[PDB]
Amino acid sequence: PVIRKFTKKNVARAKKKYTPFSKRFKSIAAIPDLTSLP
Amino acid sequence: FADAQRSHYTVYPSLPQSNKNDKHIPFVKLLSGKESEVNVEKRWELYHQLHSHFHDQVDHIIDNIEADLKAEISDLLYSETTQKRRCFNTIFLLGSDSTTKIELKDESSRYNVLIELTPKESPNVRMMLRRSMYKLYSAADAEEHNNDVSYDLSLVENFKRLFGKDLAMVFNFKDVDSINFNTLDNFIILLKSAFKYDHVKISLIFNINTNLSNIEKNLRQSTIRLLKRNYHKLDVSSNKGFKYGNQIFQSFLDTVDGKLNLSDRFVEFILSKMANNTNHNLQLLTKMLDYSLMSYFFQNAFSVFIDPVNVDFLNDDYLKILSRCPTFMFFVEGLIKQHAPADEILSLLTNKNRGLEEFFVEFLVRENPINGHAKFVARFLEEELNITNFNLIELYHNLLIGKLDSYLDRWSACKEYKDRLHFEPIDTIFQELFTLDNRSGLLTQSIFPSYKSNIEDNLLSWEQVLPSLDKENYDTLSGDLDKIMAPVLGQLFKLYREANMTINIYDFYIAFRETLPKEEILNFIRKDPSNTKLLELAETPDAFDKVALILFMQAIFAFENMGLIKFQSTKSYDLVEKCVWRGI
Amino acid sequence: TKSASSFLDTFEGYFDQRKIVRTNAKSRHTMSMAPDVTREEFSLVSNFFNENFQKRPRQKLFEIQKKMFPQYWFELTQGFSLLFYGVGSKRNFLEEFAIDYLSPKIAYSQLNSIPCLILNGYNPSCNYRDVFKEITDLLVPAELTRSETKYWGNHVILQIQKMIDFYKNQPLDIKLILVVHNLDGPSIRKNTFQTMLSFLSVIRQIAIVASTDHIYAPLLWDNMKAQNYNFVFHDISNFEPSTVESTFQDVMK
């Protein structure tokens, strides 16, 4: 297929999400009660 | 405003939709505005026929030097072996600019890669190695129709078992005079260990733009003795062996064969400007000949008469123009001085238009072959005599002057042929409207100008660029100022020329302050009707110095970014240094 | 009077005026004793004297050299680049030549107008990567493929080389007019910018209309740069007051 200029065979990425808390519901008036959340 | 404060503002110019004219060609009305529009259209089409017929041959010569060079290099790149078998083939391409494409042959069960290398592509040895093995693995795995390797000579070691083919890499160093030779012999040492792998064949190709005594002076001696195993030289330059100057200047005569002529001064100017430049001469030949043609059809109305169909559009102003040719004056003086027929010279002097109008059309059937006989001298020197070191431009120059026999005896090889290679031509009447020429200094002023001299001339004298007027002084704002006062930045240069090498800026200001009129500018400064700020500084008892420092500092900081003034002693900027002298 | 020079300006005028002057014959006068001004008095008398000292002779000169414009269009359409050296600002010359005259005449002759990329090269904030970004949407060429890009090469120079081999199989009409002001300015005289602008002039389908200000300008171009430009030089020195560019440079006391 392709011939690459260099390789990064020993790479380890975490399992971490990119979208922040601001885009959970996109509703400031309807944020649930964060204290007694599971 | 604020659009000349940002770099690269693109601008779409809006346009009126149509004007409905023939103004689609730049050729203006000649003969002081008396020419016909159909003649201007025919002049444009005729110039384009001539220019296309020239450049369609120039392009074949220029794309034939590559088919000669690829044929040349790829014969001493192959078809030879050395008994040592542990050496790389080396080809020194002398005088070559890095502009050539190299072709590698079939030679099946063996790859052939070409690794071009550059002084930008070589800051040290490891980038050369990584780029070389990257190009090798790319041009090996893409010419096959999967793992990742490291880019070093291990790929050269196991190229036989990775792919199954023998390696033959041909290196190609582009500007060998511009690479570090300290990096280059390190790369040659690092390549020398590839000899032990029994399936490689390294070939080195050096594109040198200087002589070979400057490459083997900078290299180390062990690398030079390694390069002395199977080396070949090859002179690649279009001045060696004048075959491509004898095909561009030959093809220029095939467009002007009978219609146009070349002057003496023009061909010697060509020879003077082709000899002060060695690297590219097949381009400085064409961009002088085309600019000679372009300054002809833009200037000479009689170019419309170089085609033998436009013979009937001889208006009165063409008969005025052709009558004041001095060769025709020599012919009419001949018609006076040898014999005396009255009523024929009385006709053709100023009265009869029909005799002069029909007389000129006889003067176009004549050929008088200069360029029709010079090809015979070229074929005689190339085929029958076998001398391939002659210049068609200089032979044509001596043939145009008439001292061709000196140039033929310059070799002392054709002593039995100085009658066969002889030709004494004469002039045909009305050459001097039909000759490509340079007597006005046009090909000098706008191809090879004396740049710095023109800048200094316009700075010093300045009357050859600014006019003097005699009516527009009272409706203006400065009518009496253009005659008694030199322009600032052109007046300051008169003091800059006759200053020392170290110019004190206060003395350079005082010398500028007492070369200005005092009792004129203190009257002039109160002229503006709109503003009120310019008049109160004239009500200040030191107006002349405060208006003199503004103009002086403006001229000084205007010279400085032009290049004539260096401010030495940073954090002072008070003692400037003159750093451009006139006439050099 | 203040120079004891036997010769004037030639090589011997260079050798003669480069003597050695003693410590008492010297005049160490600071320019503090020059009568100081404000910035606004300079700003006022400057713009007064720009258009009210030789205004009508300079307009006469621009009308004299304004009937030279068909030769400039002829030289551009025959393959050459243009170079306008001379005393004074050549800015309004190229703003009144390339915008007004040139691109209407080019647009009519091949039948919107022809795009004009002005390039203020007297501004020291003149990178060639955003300038080549501005070229690659007025032409929109092809992208650099994997085989044609190289190991950490320069993508701009390789893209211009790809455009050069693309535009040998094309009709010869001007597709852009690239108007460089002060081609030897402080951020464009460097080598890779000149390699860019010299490889752009190889294309017949772009007309380069440049201008210079410095006097040692022609040594920026060797036998490879001066061959890919193939300039024709035109001294249009018109003694302009040059006040667009001096706001960039330091006018420090």
From Swiss-Prot, chain A:
Location of the protein in the cell: Nucleus
Highest taxon listed in the record's lineage: Eukaryota
Other comment: Present with 3930 molecules/cell in log phase SD medium.
Domain notes: The N-terminus is dedicated to mating-type repression.
Subunit-structure text: Component of the origin recognition complex (ORC) composed of at least ORC1, ORC2, ORC3, ORC4, ORC5 and ORC6. Interacts with MCM10 and TAH11.
Function statement: Component of the origin recognition complex (ORC) that binds origins of replication. It has a role in both chromosomal replication and mating type transcriptional silencing. Binds to the ARS consensus sequence (ACS) of origins of replication.
Similarity comment: Belongs to the ORC1 family.
The protein, known as: Origin recognition complex subunit 1
The organism's taxonomic lineage, starting at the top: Eukaryota, Fungi, Dikarya, Ascomycota, Saccharomycotina
Gene name of this polypeptide: ORC1
UniProtKB/Swiss-Prot annotation, chain B:
Keyword DNA-binding attributed: yes
Keyword hit for Acetylation: yes
Self-association and partners: Component of the origin recognition complex (ORC) composed of at least ORC1, ORC2, ORC3, ORC4, ORC5 and ORC6. Interacts with ORC6.
Function according to Swiss-Prot or TrEMBL: Component of the origin recognition complex (ORC) that binds origins of replication. It has a role in both chromosomal replication and mating type transcriptional silencing. Binds to the ARS consensus sequence (ACS) of origins of replication.
Keyword list, A-Z: Acetylation, DNA replication, DNA-binding, Nucleus
GO terms, biological process: DNA replication initiation; pre-replicative complex assembly involved in nuclear cell cycle DNA replication; silent mating-type cassette heterochromatin formation
Organism: Saccharomyces cerevisiae (strain ATCC 204508 / S288c)
Protein name: Origin recognition complex subunit 3
Subcellular localization(s) per the UniProt record: Nucleus
UniProt similarity note: Belongs to the ORC3 family.
Primary subcellular site in the record, as a coarse category: nucleus
UniProtKB/Swiss-Prot annotation, chain C:
Localisation per UniProt entry: Nucleus
Membrane-spanning segments: none
Domain of life: Eukaryota
Other remarks in the entry: Present with 1700 molecules/cell in log phase SD medium.
Similarity section: Belongs to the ORC2 family.
Complexes and interactors: Component of the origin recognition complex (ORC) composed of at least ORC1, ORC2, ORC3, ORC4, ORC5 and ORC6. Interacts with MCM10 and TAH11.
Record's function text: Component of the origin recognition complex (ORC) that binds origins of replication. It has a role in both chromosomal replication and mating type transcriptional silencing. Binds to the ARS consensus sequence (ACS) of origins of replication.
Protein's recorded name: Origin recognition complex subunit 2
Species in which this protein is naturally found: Saccharomyces cerevisiae (strain ATCC 204508 / S288c) (Baker's yeast)
Species classification: Eukaryota, Fungi, Dikarya, Ascomycota, Saccharomycotina
